[PDB]
Design a protein around this ligand. Structure first.
Ligand SMILES: Nc1nc2c(ncn2[C@@H]2O[C@H](COP(=O)(O)OP(=O)(O)OP(=O)(O)O)[C@@H](O)[C@H]2O)c(=O)[nH]1
Ligand SMILES: Nc1ncnc2c1ncn2[C@@H]1O[C@H](COP(=O)(O)OP(=O)(O)CP(=O)(O)O)[C@@H](O)[C@H]1O
Ligand SMILES: COc1cccc(-c2cc(N3CCc4cc(OC)c(OC)cc4C3)nc(N)n2)c1
Ligand SMILES: Nc1nc2c(ncn2[C@@H]2O[C@H](COP(=O)(O)OP(=O)(O)O)[C@@H](O)[C@H]2O)c(=O)[nH]1
Ligand SMILES: [Ca+2]
Ligand SMILES: [Ca+2]
Ligand SMILES: [Ca+2]
Ligand SMILES: [Ca+2]
Ligand SMILES: [Mg+2]
Ligand SMILES: [Mg+2]
Ligand SMILES: [Mg+2]
Lengths: 438, 349, 425, 62
């Protein structure tokens, strides 16, 4: 067995980490006090769930996770919440003043003061691993901590753990749920410096999660709690292959091999169905073909864009629940004759499929309904570049007037990095254009 | 009240639409780069579709269908027809055409030309390309060598298409023509055919033995007005409207425009637009789309209709701007942004 | 993350006293400093403005400054006079005579050290000092002259801390003396360099609001301060109560100030009060964007918005505030700059103020704020071209060439505001 | 539409369906830049405290 260490950075990363680990415990039958009645290997074991949880002699199962925020109010809620017993204190690291949505403040000013401590605490978990695979880093593009410190952390993890894979779960900024106008700056800056150090990044536009919550759960004004419990379902479906017995996506390296032919273009598009409200007391359960079809409706994607006008480089279908291969092939045959699905000429036109028979787990008292079967499609499509263009344009509008730039230069940055990063995004946007148009 | 933006200055049609929306008293125009808009009268090239539908609390509409170029570029249109099972190589209303890069179909073009040459079938051909506008870039011949040589001389793509040697010829004049039809597709993908079409008329008598002359075989209004001495001999501006053409067919050939030609027109429109419906439809998309299309047909002497091209940024006939432009706002825009008989034939599908 | 409050001069100490009366009520603390409230949500972020003391008492983290004891003697005897720390009254004896030079260079220089001594003690007992807020007028001598002096001294000892001010701008319609434009111009030059956020409270606007809209034929300083304290309660409401969104002074400044020198905000409030009819979200939103609800005598339609923040208080159809906020922008979309995307942000605090079920506070960084500085610059030059009343200042050591510099910098400030009002994408 | 590499266990199955076949920085280099921004931060702070020192002179000059 090979362990995976999760790192949750900034408010968004931390709060989403709370949702994931809450869901993980329910999926594995672990109680809030860390006891696991179903585990008969007391004090140890190399089972599949042990990739994410270590075991103590007392029988407590402990997430291989580190939480880190530059201000404590968010992690303080972890230290006192339902799962306070799950984590032991040195896993939770807090500063005193945050980065004020300033990439430079998080990366340079405050980053330098706390980077060594964080790495030391990460090394204390890596020392408990017999065959560490890599890291899963949860953070926001928009926040100062989530953007600036994460990039710093990613840089030094590539030096101290050179041959270990690093996966990102990144929250793409949306005006509907943000109170910050400088997020485009932080998004471009962090992407530029993190790009070379990330093997696979799953991007989640808060705009997508917002509409999905109100359209499919009839929640009039979703909160972060609504959004995080939905995101955790997707995160779980993506990470389930690492935590349960299986053949597909069992090593972090397989995510890169299956989903990323070119290193720079490592942003797969996630699509998830079915999202069903708990208020609908009796619902017409959806067939395999209906949820598989739903994977190609932009309204169900984690990032709004049109794959019809891009090209696919890889596709994985991660079913959870009562699904058998035959029903999948039936749907795929029908779907291909009814949808615009063009692969690049230098890649096969095929789906890598995986099925876990355990149905999706929903947190008691949540907003989601329990369903018989669900699917998360991971697609590396050029259409995701639309999200970069949107962001690049917002960056351009403010930078032409140098708006807000003084806040970054005042923290030690040079204007060069703004144009240096923006130029990198220009290439990235043009790299997507080469691969998928004409 | 609603807002909109103009991003195409050289647009005849939508110049009147913006003009007429303003005069409504419920529409407000903004700069060419203010995203806080309800409607975008976008540009013909590199319209930023990716930046639409991401403004909170703003329904956003645009007057173009992303991907509609596959029907409005001559080379792509050929590959769409030949490779679409809904249309197929066995297409009765499209002339046997081939895409020739100066993927490529050079042999297979010569393939039938040889079989046709041996069979004494009038193997007269034409080459075309979407780049050459203003009647520049057009070659007609009877043997490939002289035509294919012209293709290689230029550096862009060119399609070779069977020139139709037996067009329906009007009298008096013994002259050629094409038919232009305007079709509006709204956000719901209803297909609306404008009840008024126009014939772009050739003012010179047809001559099959002589294509040396550069005006007896093309009739795009511009050519006739700049390279023909009889621009307007028979009708105002080389433009004959349906009422007159219908009366002519009744008197000369004892038939109607609706029966002899307009049924085939409505079938080709439906066939083309429904073929691409799953690739451009915006029914469940974060932004909606409509678009005005200009289909160009022609009629042979057996009263069969042939589609020649589809134009995605078409101009209108001078007389009909008012009525048509008013029709767009009614069906395409107001249908989405309500306010305080019909001129369209709904092509049902 | 604690805030240290400072109030200097007559105006500063009186709007300051009302501010503490208001928020003390909102948090449930009586004039003696004892908490007697109904909800624990009042106390979650009480530390932000209060220290906890022996006997389970909360003491405002406030410092009281003046060069003459008159107004400060009143505060101690006022409604909440006994709430303040008696050690935090640092007052001189002579006064400043509405003379900027006396507060900044002579009389104030003597007392300033005693003021910073109290600042250090308040700062040394702060878990993580967040910044300072100053209340003061720009037309007097103590608040204007000494206040800008204190700001300069605080930035020297706390250069990485946020310095914010609620600055009352003078107006002939509510004028104490004629040299008020001189003192204002000198203070603004200091505020342009040493503050991060200045809320420009214009007494002309407060008067017009009291007289024209509230139908008060003869307003007092108490009537104007009721509006100023209401705004300060609204501006600080998100910091003082457990509010869904995480509000920090430096995070707020980063999001509101695109250019360092253009940090002068127009405050706004709705409804305007001195009734029982429940005000609807349609009515709250359209009022806060009206010139008649602005605390700075400037027309927003004569300028452009760099950033905007509307803050709604109470239980309300929050889906409706969104619908309407997005409505009011479409009506005025020409008055928002296109080069700062999504520059209108909204925050909601479920707890309303006293006597209202729904309220709304408006914070705007608009280029129309130049109209205020242009007004002050005219009054300044009208006297300065004839050097009238300068002897009051040259007698205290100042040179007329410091006056010329201040004038130039404020006309430079106006020019900069004009640059971005005409800028486009 | 070929089905290949079908592995299966008690927890589930996995397979692949094909429809159409195909047609480095160091630590020292980092540490420097964090310090290069730190030294730039100090220079801005020194320039501020000098500007303030200049204004303290003028104050007591008056
Ligand atoms: N989905 C989701 N996104 C969040 C959440 N919290 C914050 N975000 C995103 O992050 C932005 C706000 O910045 P934060 O992530 O909270 O702050 P940070 O990353 O810790 O950086 P600092 O606050 O400056 O220390 C918002 O605009 C969101 O896009 C959350 O709970 N869920
Ligand atoms: N297969 C065919 N048979 C007969 N004539 C043909 C033909 N293909 C093209 N033509 C001639 O070419 C002309 C139309 O050319 P085409 O429409 O491709 O140029 P164009 O698209 O640049 C002008 P527009 O943009 O206004 O539609 C007609 O006048 C017609 O006579
Ligand atoms: C004078 O010292 C103080 C003391 C306390 C607060 C302030 C202050 C308030 C403020 N308000 C209120 C709440 C709020 C919350 C937001 O999101 C969470 C938001 O969007 C980022 C904007 C606003 C607008 N804006 C600025 N700049 N300062 C100043
Ligand atoms: N709103 C308000 N403004 C005041 C008050 N007292 C003075 N001012 C303003 O400040 C100016 C007079 O300055 P003053 O308060 O005497 O300054 P001080 O000498 O430092 O106390 C006038 O032009 C007023 O605009 C007050 O009680 N309320
Ligand atoms: Ca075990
Ligand atoms: Ca690496
Ligand atoms: Ca003395
Ligand atoms: Ca001293
Ligand atoms: Mg934070
Ligand atoms: Mg054309
Ligand atoms: Mg006074």
């Amino acid at each position: 067995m090979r362990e995976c260490i999760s790192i949750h950075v900034g408010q968004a990363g931390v709060q989403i980490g709370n949702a994931c680990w809450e869901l993980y415990c329910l999926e594995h039958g672990i109680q809030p006090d860390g006891q696991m009645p179903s585990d008969k290997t007391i004090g140890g074991g190399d089972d599949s769930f042990n990739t994410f949880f270590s075991e103590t002699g007392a029988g407590k199962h402990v997430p291989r996770a580190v939480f880190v925020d530059l201000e404590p109010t968010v992690i303080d809620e972890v230290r006192t919440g339902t799962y306070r017993q799950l984590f032991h204190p040195e896993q939770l690291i807090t500063g005193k003043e945050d980065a004020a949505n300033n990439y430079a403040r998080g990366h340079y000013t405050i980053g330098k003061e706390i980077i060594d401590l964080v790495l030391d605490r990460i090394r204390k978990l890596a020392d408990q691993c017999t065959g560490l695979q890599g890291f899963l880093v949860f953070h926001s593009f928009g926040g100062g901590t989530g953007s600036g410190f994460t990039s710093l952390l990613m840089e030094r993890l590539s030096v101290d753990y050179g041959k270990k894979s690093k996966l990102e779960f990144s929250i793409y900024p949306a005006p509907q749920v943000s109170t910050a106008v400088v997020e485009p700056y932080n998004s471009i800056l962090t992407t530029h410096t993190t790009l070379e150090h990330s093997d696979c990044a799953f991007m989640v536009d808060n705009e997508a999660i917002y509409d999905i919550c109100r359209r499919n759960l009839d929640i009039e004004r979703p909160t972060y709690t609504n959004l995080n419990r939905l995101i955790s379902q997707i995160v779980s479906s993506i990470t389930a292959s690492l935590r349960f017995d299986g053949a597909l996506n069992v090593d972090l390296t397989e995510f890169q091999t299956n989903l990323v032919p070119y290193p720079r273009i490592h942003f797969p598009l996630a699509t998830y169905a079915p999202v069903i409200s708990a208020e609908k007391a009796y619902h017409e359960q959806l067939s395999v073909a209906e949820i598989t079809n739903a994977c190609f409706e932009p309204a169900n994607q984690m990032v709004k864009c049109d794959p019809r006008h891009g090209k696919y480089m890889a596709c994985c279908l991660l079913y959870r629940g009562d699904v058998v291969p035959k029903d999948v092939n039936a749907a795929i045959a029908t779907i291909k004759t009814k949808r615009s699905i063009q692969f690049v000429d230098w890649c096969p036109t095929g789906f890598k499929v995986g099925i876990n028979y355990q149905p999706p787990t929903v947190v008691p008292g949540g907003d989601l309904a329990k369903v018989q079967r669900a699917v998360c499609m991971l697609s590396n499509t050029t259409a995701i570049a639309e999200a970069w263009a949107r962001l690049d344009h917002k960056f351009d509008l403010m930078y032409a007037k140098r708006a807000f730039v003084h806040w970054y230069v005042g923290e030690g940055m040079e204007e060069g990095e703004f144009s240096e990063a923006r130029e990198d995004m220009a290439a990235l946007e043009k790299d997507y254009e080469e691969v998928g148009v004409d | 009240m609603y807002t909109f933006v103009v991003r195409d200055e050289n647009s005849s049609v939508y110049a009147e639409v913006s003009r007429l929306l303003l005069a409504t008293g419920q529409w407000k125009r903004l700069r060419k780069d203010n995203p806080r808009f309800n409607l975008m009268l976008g540009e013909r090239n590199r319209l930023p579709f990716g930046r639409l539908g991401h403004e909170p609390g703003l329904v956003q509409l645009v007057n173009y269908y992303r991907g509609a170029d596959k029907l409005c570029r001559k080379a792509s249109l050929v590959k769409l027809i030949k490779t679409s099972p809904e249309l197929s190589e066995s297409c009765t209303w499209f002339p046997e055409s081939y895409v020739i890069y100066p993927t490529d179909e050079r042999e297979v073009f010569l393939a039938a030309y040889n079989r046709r040459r041996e069979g004494r079938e009038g193997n007269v051909w034409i080459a075309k390309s979407s780049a050459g506008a203003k009647g520049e870039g057009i070659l007609i011949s009877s043997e490939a060598s002289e035509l294919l040589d012209f293709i290689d001389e230029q550096g862009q793509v060119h399609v070779i298409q069977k020139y139709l040697e037996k067009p329906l010829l009007l009298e008096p004049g013994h002259r050629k023509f094409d038919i232009r039809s305007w079709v509006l597709v709204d956000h719901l993908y209803n297909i609306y055919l404008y009840r008024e079409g126009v014939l772009r008329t050739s003012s010179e008598p047809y001559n099959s033995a002589n294509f040396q002359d550069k005006t007896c075989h093309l009739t795009n209004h511009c050519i006739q007005k700049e390279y023909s001495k009889n621009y307007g001999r028979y009708e105002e501006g080389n433009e004959m409207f349906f009422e007159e053409f219908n009366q002519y067919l009744m008197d000369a050939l004892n038939t109607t425009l609706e029966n002899s030609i307009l049924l085939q027109i409505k079938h080709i429109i439906r066939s083309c637009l429904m073929c691409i419906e799953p690739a451009i439809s915006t029914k469940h998309l974060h932004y909606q789309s409509f678009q005005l299309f200009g289909f160009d047909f022609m009629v042979d002497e057996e009263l069969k209709v042939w589609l020649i091209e589809v134009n995605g940024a078409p101009a209108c006939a001078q007389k009909l701007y008012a009525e048509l432009c008013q029709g767009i706002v009614d069906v395409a825009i107001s249908s989405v942004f309500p306010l305080a008989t019909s001129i369209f034939i709904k092509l049902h599908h | 993350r604690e805030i240290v409050h400072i109030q200097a001069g007559q105006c500063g100490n009186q709007i300051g006293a009302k501010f503490w009366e208001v928020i003390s009520d909102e948090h449930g603390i009586d004039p003696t400093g004892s908490y007697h409230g109904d909800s624990d949500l009042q106390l979650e972020r009480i530390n932000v403005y209060y220290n906890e003391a022996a006997g389970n008492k909360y003491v405002p983290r406030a410092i009281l400054v003046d060069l003459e004891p008159g107004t400060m003697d009143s505060v101690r005897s006022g409604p909440f006079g006994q709430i303040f720390r008696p050690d935090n009254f640092v007052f001189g004896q002579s006064g400043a005579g509405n003379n900027w030079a006396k507060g900044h260079y002579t009389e104030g220089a003597e007392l300033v050290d005693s003021v910073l001594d109290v600042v250090r003690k308040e700062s040394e007992s702060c878990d993580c000092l967040q910044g300072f807020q100053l209340t003061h007028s720009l037309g007097g001598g103590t608040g204007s002259g000494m206040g800008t002096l204190l700001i300069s001294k605080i930035r020297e000892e706390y250069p990485d801390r946020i310095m914010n001010t609620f600055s009352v701008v003078p107006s002939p319609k509510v004028s104490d003396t004629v040299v008020e434009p001189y003192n204002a111009t000198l203070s603004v030059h200091q505020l342009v360099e040493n503050t991060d956020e200045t809320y420009c409270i214009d007494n002309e606007a407060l008067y017009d609001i009291c007289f024209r809209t509230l139908k008060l034929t003869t307003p007092t300083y108490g009537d104007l301060n009721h509006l100023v304290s209401a705004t300060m309660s609204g501006v600080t409401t998100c910091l003082r109560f457990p509010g869904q969104l995480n509000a920090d002074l430096r995070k707020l400044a980063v999001n509101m100030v695109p250019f360092p020198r253009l940090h002068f905000f127009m405050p706004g409030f709705a409804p305007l009060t001195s009734q029982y009819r429940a005000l609807t979200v349609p009515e709250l939103t359209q009022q806060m964007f009206d010139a008649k609800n602005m605390m700075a005598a400037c027309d927003p339609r004569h300028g452009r918005y760099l950033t905007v923040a509307a803050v709604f208080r109470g239980r309300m159809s929050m889906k409706e505030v969104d619908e309407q906020m997005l409505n009011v922008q479409n009506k005025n979309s020409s008055y928002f700059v296109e080069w700062i995307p999504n520059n209108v942000k909204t925050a909601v605090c479920d707890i309303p103020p006293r006597g209202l079920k729904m309220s709304a506070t408006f914070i705007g960084n608009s280029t129309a704020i130049q109209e205020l500085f242009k007004r002050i610059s005219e009054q300044f030059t009208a006297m300065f071209r004839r050097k009238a009343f300068l002897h009051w200042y040259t007698g205290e050591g100042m040179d007329e060439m410091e006056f010329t510099e201040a004038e130039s910098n404020m006309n430079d400030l106006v020019s900069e505001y004009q640059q971005y009002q005409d800028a486009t994408a | 539409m070929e089905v290949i590499e079908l592995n299966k266990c008690t927890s589930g199955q996995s397979f692949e369906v094909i429809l159409k076949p195909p047609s480095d920085p160091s630590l020292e280099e980092i540490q420097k830049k964090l310090e290069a921004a730190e030294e730039r931060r100090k220079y801005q702070e020194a320039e501020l405290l000098k500007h303030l020192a200049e204004k303290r002179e003028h104050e007591r000059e008056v």
